[PDB]
Symmetry: D3
Subunit: 218 residues, 6 copies
């Protein structure tokens, strides 16, 4: 899929819109149902990552290390986009919209406040559907994992996705305004991750679940 | 000092180079003397922020909230800059250069690894002194404190410093490459901050030390 | 208001009864409503402290340090007094009376047990309205903050409030019986504070909220 | 030994001075030898409590509950007393005097600061050996354990020791000034206790060590 | 009761079935009611332990140390047996059967998953009522407490209970298949114990409650 | 290698003795060099497991899940075996023998106590080299990972290794005495594992290191 880096950006952007995960439903929900949602959020994030141009050109160890470090940034950014046309509320699924009271009552502690701060930041910018999928693929390529063996290759992927974002905005402040929301994206994803490490849902460390599903898809 | 935003970028950049904190010595060093260093690092980070064009024109409450959230990012970025012409070592002071073994022996736990990861990232870019002081003022203005009242006024400061960094690079990928290191900068400063919260050196919470010093300078 | 230290104690005691915070209502309550209550508990504790004779004669840094260390002892003691005419229940607001089951179900963990132990201690003494306001002003002046610069001045304030309590009980075991409940008051307030640090309600460290409101009133 | 409560205070005070634990040496010291010291500190605190007039006349369950809650207050107060004629240093043993740098190097974290704050407080009072041993027996009797069955019987012990301290000072502000240092004593002992719980020296919870030794002496 | 070690195993096994704790009811339940259940689970485990042949032949200090280390393994194994004839559910009391959703909603965090893993292990073996009571008495005698003074005596008790289990299965893989579930039993009991340490129900450390009740029965 | 399960136990035992990891040297040692040792311990534990008859015939996901849960049990048991002919000391490497004081100074906290308790337990049995390698392969097969798909296939491996240990002891209490040390082995390895999770050496979670190395060898 690296031919998409060689061609014009429009076909890359459209590929990214087509590889967007299928909208997920939760079916107030019981924890069993939220656990099922989480499980499918993991599978979906992995199959998506495999369809990012360049990602599969990294070795399996670096593909895993990259995903461990940023898989929750991909999810959080998904939740944040779907929540832009909303006010003080978060779209955790197609049939699950929760304010800060419903977030904490659904068992997410104080993550609502952290996620809404990220939403407001993206809302202050009129984040387009096309930018969102360029920003999301770039957040994945911007991994800073200490476990990465081939750094050059990861750097190359990120430069290409950076270029792609510049080539989109071309045909200069706009590109940077989106990148400047990335520090908060990482910080908010670390908070979500730390929450679910603490919960340890059904006896399972999130890291341990991600590795096994990455192993199935790799 | 906002007359520096309406002029040519050269006068702003040299002003930022002029308001850099005075080089700090530690005088292997005893904790007492490292405590003293930390105490002086706090003081100089505050007087420096006071000299950032725009900052002083926020309300005192927003100035404190901004600094609490990013004061350690400003510190960490200082340390990483002075470490660019080094290999696997960190310049914590003019007379304190420690490798990862020395970092952990001096009582910084595993932060050495976290700080080197950030150093490498800045080294893979040939980061220049002028880019550094613009990135540093932009890190301060990119605060995401939940305690911020006037978000429009913070955004405005952030935009002007973003513009100023764009105007520096003008006279397209360069500015964005520097911005893409900001998420790791936030993450690394959060680790450092959490370290010192847990240490609670001399019975004192770093937050409680910062506020009192901010008080005196405001 | 230090003229109240020079005159007879009766006018000091009546001043303390008049500067007592206005009774607060919660309106089983949603967390948003409990968060609102907490926010107003902070504002109210600050304006009260400013009306304690002597407190404003300390420098702003010592006023803040003193309040950080004891603001929750002031609140806890408020809750405890209002709960003396009750049995195994706590008056958290005018319209919020909770037993140990309602305390834990309102999200206070096991703080109910800690607060009821303090209540029983004060109940075993028939704590008068007048003693309560002398004991409360004395708990504030008895701060042991490591951040206090002018210790002598804090010591002076506490000696005066101690005298005032002795001058009240005069016109010797009675005064000490009240002071001997102070260790448990501090311990119970530390527990409450540690709870709310853990909760980190809406992304906010209690310390960080107190400093900003102290900044508004100072 | 309750015949000492019906007589003149002089016979009680000299009895308290006589039942002081024998001065302890540590023999910079290795952890093994500091572990040995701690082990002996526990033993002597128990035999001392056994010799407090009143204590032995509680049920065994209330004696254990009382000691668990305040055994470290008794220890800490010993250390602070022996440190009164010192400056910025603590007498942990007859042959172990450590400043704050030595305290942290010997593995006590930041407790040195907490203990010095308490020392200063006792030093600002010209605390006398006779006042010290009365305050110490009164700290023990001021327990607030949730596990206490006979609260009336604990209260009675506490009242008698309060009275005895009043009768000592008689033959008005002096007794109250000593009582006002008790909240910091509790707070400091809780910090020390939490330190050693987290260390869990040789696999052993301090609570579990105290109970077994209390068992042997009961 | 060591005559039961000298006679034939059938009388030992029948003694163990007769000293089994009386079935407990909870009466979805309020926490007060679950707290009452817990309190009675402690009393019952202690009186049971005193009726294990050999246990009382250990000194009081070793009886306590042994019980502290394994009392929750005894409870957990009780819960697990009663749950063998169930599917994905746990019998916490006679009138309390909860699945993983009801376990977490009753306030047990993720202990349901840990307890069901232990149940499945015991179910894969058709654990008999007679084996269960031999396995339970052997888990108690298999204590690995660092506080045990007379190790030989504890070792002797465990060897006898091991023999007894071999003499039962005689009149070789069967005995070991049961012993191989013991590592998971300890691990699951440590998890339960750590949960209740964190909860600190009504201000009480489980260890501190067990010691006082052991003191009543000893 | 399952042809070793259908033959006489002698060929299996000598195969287990042959696939023992090559003796490891550390070269008081610097953390860097202890980090290097740990890195090599992980590698050899993986290649060893690959050589356990049965293991390689699980799916890759079950192989990883099994190893994650018991890799540290395998390590710990190695260290305890090499420590049998020592007193109050542990052989962490061929050139690293540390007592409890040295263990804590080398940065292992209080794990020395936990490991010696396990050593004593194995020493009270005259544990032989042949029993050790069978117990070690059986510890691996006794995994209780919640992530295990094919529980029947793990059970089968476990049964065969149990049988093999029974067949070794044949050619009745001996096998069971070795199995009764497994609960302490799990508990001790969990403590060690939790230590290194908290240390997070060089920014790396042990789980994340194991998975990547497992990846390479699979
Ligand atoms: C115990 C417990 C189990 C499951 C969940 N839980 C799990 C999910 C799935 N989504 C995980 C993240 C949520 C934050 C944004 C990035 C993805 C969810 C969604 C909504 C409410 C709850 C909830 C929360 C708590
Ligand atoms: C107990 C203790 C006291 C003091 C310190 N300690 C404190 C400092 C001061 N600088 C703080 C940060 C260091 C990381 C990069 C951003 C600034 C320092 C510098 C070098 C070694 C140690 C050390 C560490 C531990
Ligand atoms: C998540 C969460 C949000 C808010 C609260 N919460 C906050 C308050 C306000 N009072 C704070 C302290 C409570 C203990 C006594 C000293 C003052 C309150 C009052 C009653 C119930 C709950 C509750 C608790 C938990
Ligand atoms: C691992 C470790 C083992 C032992 C100790 N350690 C143990 C003691 C014994 N005294 C305990 C308290 C010390 C604080 C005041 C109340 C009594 C001690 C004394 C001096 C230095 C160290 C140290 C600290 C750390
Ligand atoms: C706050 C809180 C109070 C009380 C309880 N709580 C306490 C018990 C009593 N049993 C304790 C263990 C439970 C796990 C298996 C071994 C025994 C119980 C039983 C069922 C649900 C809850 C619950 C849980 C949480
Ligand atoms: C910071 C730090 C780095 C490395 C180590 N550290 C790491 C190792 C390697 N072995 C890990 C376990 C040790 C306990 C028994 C099972 C294997 C080791 C060996 C001896 C001393 C220290 C030490 C400890 C602490």
């Amino acid at each position: 899929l690296e031919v998409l880096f060689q061609g014009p950006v429009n076909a890359l952007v459209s590929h990214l819109l087509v590889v967007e995960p299928e909208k997920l439903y939760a079916m107030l929900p019981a924890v069993a149902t939220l656990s099922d949602l989480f499980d499918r959020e993991i599978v979906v994030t992995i199959s998506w990552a495999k369809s990012i141009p360049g990602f599969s050109s990294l070795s399996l160890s670096d593909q895993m290390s990259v995903l461990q470090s940023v898989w929750m940034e991909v999810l959080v950014l998904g939740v944040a986009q779907r929540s832009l046309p909303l006010q003080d509320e978060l779209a955790f699924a197609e049939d699950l919209v929760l304010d800060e009271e419903g977030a904490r009552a659904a068992g997410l502690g104080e993550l609502g406040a952290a996620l809404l701060q990220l939403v407001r930041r993206l809302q202050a910018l009129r984040l387009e559907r096309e930018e969102y999928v360029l920003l999301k693929a770039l957040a994945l390529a911007n991994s800073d994992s200490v476990h990465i063996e081939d750094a050059e290759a990861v750097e190359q992927l990120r430069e290409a996705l950076h270029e792609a974002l510049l080539e989109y905005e071309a045909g200069r402040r706009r590109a940077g305004r989106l990148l400047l929301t990335l520090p908060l994206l990482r910080q908010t994803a670390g908070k979500v991750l730390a929450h679910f490490y603490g919960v340890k849902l059904e006896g399972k460390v999130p890291m341990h679940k991600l590795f096994l599903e990455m192993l199935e898809a790799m």
